[PDB]
Subunit: 246 residues, 4 copies
């Protein structure tokens, strides 16, 4: 099993692994560490995979649950996902790459004033079945302790700020998060599988394949409610917790 | 001596006072307090004033030293404490002046923007090359009130890029110059305004079609800002006033 | 009857007039012209006025129908032409009102922003669900002057995303409410203001600490905007006024 | 010789060509058309190339002349470059990808109001030897007739706009231009060569290789002074024209 960095702040390729439910503990743990360290990892040549085997693999790393704007998944809910595992099924003849950004790297690049701002800022995330959650803008990752910015396209405003202030500040933060130095863009080939840490990233689909057929299979793993640098938790304004796969 | 509020967060008219250098301690003190409380105060019917008498008055309150919103001379580290401004020749229309309370603006900031501004430094410049890094929140040395320090001399914030600085400065200026924080004075003959430059910004208004307009200003020495953490402004370039 | 400018680009005081329904054609006409020229006009010493007499005056000028900058009822397609506003009960301080000339603001636009605004549509809404797509430049039906149409009822511009709309609207509002384009009136008992809603925005100011304040407004029917290319506003939802 | 699209709005790979000064007219022309159509093209496996052969090739397509912000090259000059040809010499073990955006695609995605704005807008581009040029924000490409946005990191302001307006509008335009649907990101392998149309693109280096050694060789081809949609030309405020390779 080898892990090779794809860039300075994000991304790694993991080789010498056949994904499935039969991986030993040492291998699952090596994978877990690579995920947490590199934020998004890629396995190539996984042509043996189907839906069931992908699910069997997913169960080893977490509890499975039941596009072209930058976002963190389902952040309108309080207990939004920890991670997802995504395999290519049918790919277009061109385009169709995917972007990830490290929101840990983004936080690390913030100068002190913007650290003080974001560590003391709350965003309303919504899906508009009405989900509204006030999340902190800095989250302390529950497995690594690393601070990560929490924002993305589900943010509708910041508490205490007016609509214009919120629009300007959100875009300032998005501009920083999605700086290319914080990002990896993956050109999918058949057999590829991506896994990302949704507590430490945003991602974005790209509509550059002229609507040619494209099919991916995603399995998403249950996460927990964010805690900020002061130990404060996200507040549910409206909506229910996300639930495991039935 | 009476002090009459002109608005909730800023401005008062002081009546029953003949400005000059012969005012007693009690009266000079009441004037000082009105100024610190109301941020800009106005005296009407001061027709006896000339440059000499204005200066004699000014000396009781301190040591004597357009159309963009600014705090005076903030490209310098020890920028002025206050100014005293008399109408001499007024246009037949227009020519009003605006002041904003930067104390009021700070008090209206929600918690996130307090945490931002209390940890933020702005570079102020006059382009003699004056460049000073001032804190964005200054603690008034006489009242203890916190005031936003920004305005048109700001060229950027330390650690932010040019676009971030442009957007943030305008966000802070939009807050500071909200009309609830401002008083606009239409000058009549004999009017004098005095403002606390440690707690305000002001702005001339170009709405008199360049008719002749003459005012006489006397400016009083101030000290170097202290921020909420006790830190002082940093001279990058230039000398003290 | 005398008309005195208050500023270069906006505002005049009309003296020598006792407002009411018994004014002759000549006087009603001079008042109409002063209004169209100066965008907002003020009458002082109108202590004889009551609701009935204000309405009788209003009927000579048209057909009778807070703290954010807006043009009245622009979420409707045929929004008002003008309003007439009388002080009834005034606070002991604060309580001034601001008007901006959107004609002046249009005239200050450089060529690129004229090309933008002359080809721009804004969605105005009241959230009865009123939604209207208005042009951002309207051609005044009586004067032919071009005026910016924007303000706080704007929710977005057709073809722009939410962030673009937020940034552009604020850019246009920053231009419109530049103090050179505005008049701020401190109300005294007996004061009446009348403004042309086709050529202005206005804004109440919350600087009187919620002391009691009562004004009486009468609003006059207007028509549907025409833009520089002859195009009319589009009702998306709601009825005509 | 084959040309394969890499994405809907930008980028193509050209195969079955050995780059050099010996290419026949038909081949040079096929290359020219591919460049103008796809805005940036890539040739792989060119391990025979050295500086001299790259130059011999460049001479077939134009007249050769004498990083991590998005820009169009040398736009502070009036007659800024038409195109560049870039080969990898020494590559880092990770990171080091390059981004291009199509400013033709960007113009095509503008809604009517922003077309009216930009077609009637002028930007001051500067290098701060003092180069200052007022360029139109829409340029009509001299070979294809296509309209392209002209902006990027050398813009210091727009004529008639104040500093804040200019900052906000430039970023609005950059945000549109650099939307991922308008972009291609190339992971360099040894032997790769990129050629881009500088009249129809912006590009950006990415600092994500932790300053490992990296060496590219660039040859840049002379361009001409922009003309806008009204037939108006760029204005030299200060500085000299760019000059051919001595
Ligand atoms: Cl491979
Ligand atoms: Cl990218
Ligand atoms: Cl005002
Ligand atoms: Cl290959
Ligand atoms: Fe997603
Ligand atoms: Fe000043
Ligand atoms: Fe109103
Ligand atoms: Fe370059």
């Amino acid at each position: 099993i080898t892990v090779t960095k794809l860039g300075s702040r994000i991304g790694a390729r993991v080789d010498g692994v056949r994904l499935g439910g039969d991986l030993d503990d040492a291998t699952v743990e090596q994978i877990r560490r690579a995920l947490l360290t590199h934020k998004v990892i890629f396995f190539r040549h996984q042509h043996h995979l189907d839906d069931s085997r992908q699910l069997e693999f997913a169960r080893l790393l977490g509890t499975p649950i039941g596009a072209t704007r930058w976002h963190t998944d389902v952040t309108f809910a309080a207990n939004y996902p920890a991670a997802s595992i995504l395999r290519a099924v049918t790919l277009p003849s061109y385009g169709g790459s995917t972007l990830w950004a490290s929101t840990v790297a983004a936080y690390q690049q913030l100068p002190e004033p913007l650290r003080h701002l974001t560590e003391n800022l709350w965003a309303l995330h919504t899906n508009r079945p009405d989900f509204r959650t006030e999340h902190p803008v800095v989250r302390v990752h529950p497995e690594t302790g690393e601070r990560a910015l929490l924002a993305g396209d589900f943010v509708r405003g910041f508490v205490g700020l007016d609509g214009h202030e919120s629009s300007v500040l959100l875009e300032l933060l998005q501009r920083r998060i999605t700086m290319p130095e914080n990002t990896v863009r993956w050109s999918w080939a058949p057999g590829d599988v991506a896994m990302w840490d949704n507590r430490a990233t945003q991602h974005r689909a790209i509509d550059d394949y002229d609507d040619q057929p494209r099919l991916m299979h995603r399995i998403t793993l249950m996460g927990d409610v964010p805690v900020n640098v002061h130990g404060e938790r996200s507040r549910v304004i409206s909506g229910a917790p996300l639930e495991v796969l039935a």
